């Protein structure tokens, strides 16, 4: 009968949603918060339409990491941001301009509120996945990273010298070494 509060939908600080997005049926709620966050992320960037949504997540083998700050809002919790990850099949150019058919884990979407940015939240999201997915920053690819994410990557994981591509993904020297 009574609509779930944020703490019932997402008990943990970091929540890992699947293709199966997971009193009433909670899915209509979970759906909304994913679509909202998707539009927010898509609007922060100058994107035509959202690249992240409840629908899209149901179609693909991606992982969505939700970070809920439990103290905010009287202790009901608030969603500060998310990080979406999945395996794309890519033809990347190595340092000699030869295409390499590979299928790395990629950062597909990544967003924190416009305010509350430049707090430890993005770094915590990233650090979580990395341990969960058991992977290094350098061995994974990045779908059209923004200036801020490139700043983020360089200062957190020393990722600096990007190997030239043309398919709007980004990999670093260490990706091949």
The rounded distance, in Å, linking the Cα atoms of 105 and 84 is 11
Distances 154 to 8, 10, 163 between C-alpha atoms, Å: 36, 31, 14
Q: Does 160 bind ligand ACO (CB under 6 A)?
A: no
Per CB under 6 A, the segment of 28-36, 57-65, 87-95, 142-150 that binds ligand ACO is 142-150
CB-nearer residue toward ligand ACO: 19 or 123: 123
154 labeled binding residue: yes
Q: Does 167 bind ligand ACO (CB under 6 A)?
A: no
Cβ contact 131:170 at 8 Å: no
Give the x/- contact pattern for ligand ACO in 112-141, rule: CB under 6 A.
x----xxxxxxx------------------
Cβ contact 138:94 at 8 Å: no
Give the x/- contact pattern for ligand ACO in 1-40, rule: CB under 6 A.
----------------------------------------
Q: Does 155 bind ligand ACO (CB under 6 A)?
A: yes
Q: Around Cβ 96, how many Cβ atoms within 10 Å? A: 7
Residue 94, classified by CB atoms within 10 Å of its CB into exposed (0-12), middle (13-18) or buried (19+), is middle
Residue 43: what are its φ and ψ, rounded to 5°? -85, -30
Among 63, 77, 143, 159, binds ligand ACO (CB under 6 A): 143
The rounded distance, in Å, linking the Cα atoms of 113 and 41 is 8
Min separation Cβ 61 and ligand ACO, Å: 17
Among 21, 107, 129, 141, binds ligand ACO (CB under 6 A): 107
CB-nearer residue toward ligand ACO: 8 or 43: 43
The rounded distance, in Å, linking the Cα atoms of 143 and 166 is 11
Q: Does 110 bind ligand ACO (CB under 6 A)?
A: yes
């Amino acid at each position: 009968d009574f609509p779930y509060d944020l703490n019932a939908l997402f008990p943990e600080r970091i929540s890992v949603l699947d293709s199966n997005l997971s009193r009433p049926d909670p899915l209509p709620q979970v759906t909304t918060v994913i679509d909202e966050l998707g539009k927010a992320s898509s609007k922060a960037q100058q994107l035509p339409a959202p690249i992240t949504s409840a629908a899209k997540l149901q179609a693909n083998r991606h992982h969505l990491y939700l970070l809920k700050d439990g103290e905010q809002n009287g202790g009901r919790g608030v969603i500060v941001g998310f990080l979406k990850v999945g395996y794309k099949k890519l033809f990347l150019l190595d340092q000699r301009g030869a295409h390499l058919e590979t299928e790395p884990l990629c950062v597909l979407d990544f967003y924190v509120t416009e305010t509350l940015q430049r707090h430890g939240y993005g770094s915590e999201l990233f650090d979580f996945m990395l341990k969960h997915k058991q992977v290094e920053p350098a061995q994974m690819a990045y779908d059209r990273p923004s200036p801020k994410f490139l700043s983020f990557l360089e200062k957190r994981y020393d990722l600096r010298n990007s190997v030239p591509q043309v398919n709007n993904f980004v990999v670093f020297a260490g990706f091949f070494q």
